[PDB]
Amino acid sequence: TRAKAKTRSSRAGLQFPVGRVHRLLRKGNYAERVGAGAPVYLAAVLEYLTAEILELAGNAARDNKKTRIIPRHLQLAVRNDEELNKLLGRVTIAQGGVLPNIQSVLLPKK
Amino acid sequence: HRYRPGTVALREIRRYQKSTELLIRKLPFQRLVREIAQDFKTDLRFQSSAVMALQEASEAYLVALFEDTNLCAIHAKRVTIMPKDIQLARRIRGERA
Amino acid sequence: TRKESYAIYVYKVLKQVHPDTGISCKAMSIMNSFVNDVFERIAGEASRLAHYNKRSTITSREIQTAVRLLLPGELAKHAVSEGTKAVTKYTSAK
Amino acid sequence: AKRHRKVLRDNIQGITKPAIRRLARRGGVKRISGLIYEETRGVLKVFLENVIRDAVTYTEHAKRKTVTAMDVVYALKRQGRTLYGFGG
Amino acid sequence: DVQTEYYKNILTKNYSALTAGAKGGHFSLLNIMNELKKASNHPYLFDNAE
DNA sequence: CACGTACGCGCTGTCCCCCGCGTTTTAACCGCCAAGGGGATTACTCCCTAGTCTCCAGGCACGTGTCAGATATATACATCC
């Protein structure tokens, strides 16, 4: 009566793999015991962070008339959001560039 | 028709902050990486992605250093960056400390 | 060689938040590195939390405190909410 | 009117002007402008609320109401401001 | 009645109800017996109670 | 490499605000209750839950054929000189 092998990610209503997070926690040399709800909770947290950055990157691609997310859109999405900017302030994104910012002293006269 | 000194620099500032290409040529950077690597040991092979990752690391580090240097120069009531601005920024970051 | 990554899961998350927007390979590698980095940070913080409290197990409380410590501000409290509801559904089910 | 509240709110002014002057004398500062002290109080408040928030999170992981010194040590350690003399 | 409801709020700790209409809401329930003695003396000893 | 001009730097004035000093206040500090709760250990008991093992099945990865939308021509009707 092995009913259809119901996965843990579908039980938790997540898209990120719960069992794979459990395997990486068990083999990652963190503790010799791992609870049942910890991979569910960690997969949900990783899914939420991925969804937030992907939504802002899709918005950044939409404002640049693009239908395909490039690293520049990810860099703009990370740096223009201040909570993500202080989450990944010590993080380099390759082929991302910088925010367009000119100091007001360097602006000309009028 | 000659241009005022400063509007061309502002045009390059607005241009190079938009595009994300590497501003250093590939072959001099590969030669510099190999020359720097060969004193630690001889006979070092390099993957292309390793030199590329070193290149974007150098890009990000030096661009952030020139932002801090420009802030130091603006704080000193100047628009021209100087080596004293560079050594001031590195110290407050802790590199010269 | 079967090389492990988080490709299809990030792709289906992208299709959830933007059903008509694609993604490139370099952006996918950046997203994979981000997920691995955040997983490593939260797991290391939870391992340290278990070590300081003389606990040999890692439960949802250690991961919750790791999210509250590492993720800054309001991002933490929504992430804590999203995870907490999921554990509730999984208990209802397993 | 003898009415006043029990809880005091101006304790950020409890970090007095000569205390900040002594701090700058230890820092090697010769001359101090008059607007320094409010900025120093704000910076101290921001740093203290960051460290205390992390220490309170470390305390309530342990299901405790008392903030021990080891929680403060761990809170300083996570931000890269590790402190010696209290870890043991 | 105010003393009775303050005694009931302290003895059966009711931080949300003890806050109520206070804008700050900074109530300390450490030293429970001291707060019970204050409630037995006068409700105006507590903040935002008059 | 040549030109040219903008800005870094030196000098001078000026005024203003910070420093030094004297005097007065005031709260930090040390030493005291007064009882009560929080928390660190030591020892003990119990039970739930996560590791371990075996077996199996479908999710993921790869490869491939097709398929509907986007792009580029082939030919026919309307029209200017």
UniProtKB/Swiss-Prot annotation, chain B:
Localisation: Nucleus; Chromosome
Modified residues (Phosphotyrosine): Y3
In-chain residues carrying the UniProt-annotated modification N6-lactoyllysine: K18, K41
Modified positions (Phosphoserine) in chain numbering: S19, S48
Residues modified to N6-glutaryllysine: K18, K41, K77, K84
Main location: nucleus
PTM description: Acetylation is generally linked to gene activation. Acetylation at Lys-84 (H3K122ac) by EP300/p300 plays a central role in chromatin structure: localizes at the surface of the histone octamer and stimulates transcription, possibly by promoting nucleosome instability.
Sites bearing Phosphothreonine, chain numbering: T42, T69
Modification type N6-crotonyllysine: residues: K18
One GO cellular component term: nucleoplasm
Residues annotated with N6-methyllysine modification: K18, K26, K41, K84
Key words of the record: Acetylation, ADP-ribosylation, Chromosome, Citrullination, DNA-binding, Hydroxylation, Lipoprotein, Methylation, Nucleosome core, Nucleus, Palmitate, Phosphoprotein, Ubl conjugation
Record PTM N6-(2-hydroxyisobutyryl)lysine, positions in chain: K18, K26, K41, K84
Quaternary structure and interacting proteins, as annotated: The nucleosome is a histone octamer containing two molecules each of H2A, H2B, H3 and H4 assembled in one H3-H4 heterotetramer and two H2A-H2B heterodimers. The octamer wraps approximately 147 bp of DNA.
Name of this protein: Histone H3.2
Phylogenetic placement of the source organism: Eukaryota, Metazoa, Chordata, Craniata, Vertebrata
Full-sequence range covered: 40 to 136 of 136
From Swiss-Prot, chain D:
GO molecular function, one term: protein heterodimerization activity
Positions of post-translational N6-acetyllysine modification: K2, K17, K45, K65, K77
Record protein name field: Histone H4
GO cellular component terms listed in the entry, alphabetical order: nucleosome; nucleus
Keyword terms, alphabetized: Acetylation, Chromosome, Citrullination, DNA-binding, Hydroxylation, Isopeptide bond, Methylation, Nucleosome core, Nucleus, Phosphoprotein, Ubl conjugation
Residue ranges for the DNA-binding region feature of this UniProt entry: 2-6
GO terms (BP aspect): nucleosome assembly
Swiss-Prot record, chain E:
Description of the deletion phenotype: Decreased sensitivity to the cytotoxic effects of 6-azauracil.
Free-text note on domains in this protein's UniProt record: The 2 chromodomains are involved in the binding to the histone H3 methyllysine at position 4 (H3K4me3).
UniProt record similarity statement: Belongs to the SNF2/RAD54 helicase family.
Note: Present with 1620 molecules/cell in log phase SD medium.
Described purpose of this protein according to its UniProt entry: ATP-dependent chromatin-remodeling factor which functions as substrate recognition component of the transcription regulatory histone acetylation (HAT) complexes SAGA and SLIK. It recognizes H3K4me. SAGA is involved in RNA polymerase II-dependent transcriptional regulation of approximately 10% of yeast genes. At the promoters, SAGA is required for recruitment of the basal transcription machinery.
Subunit and interaction comment: Component of the 1.8 MDa SAGA complex, which consists of at least of TRA1, CHD1, SPT7, TAF5, ADA3, SGF73, SPT20/ADA5, SPT8, TAF12, TAF6, HFI1/ADA1, UBP8, GCN5, ADA2, SPT3, SGF29, TAF10, TAF9, SGF11 and SUS1. TAF5, TAF6, TAF9, TAF19, TAF12 and ADA1 seem to be present in 2 copies. SAGA is built of 5 distinct domains with specialized functions. Domain I (containing TRA1) probably represents the activator interaction surface.
Localization in the cell: Nucleus
Protein name: Chromo domain-containing protein 1
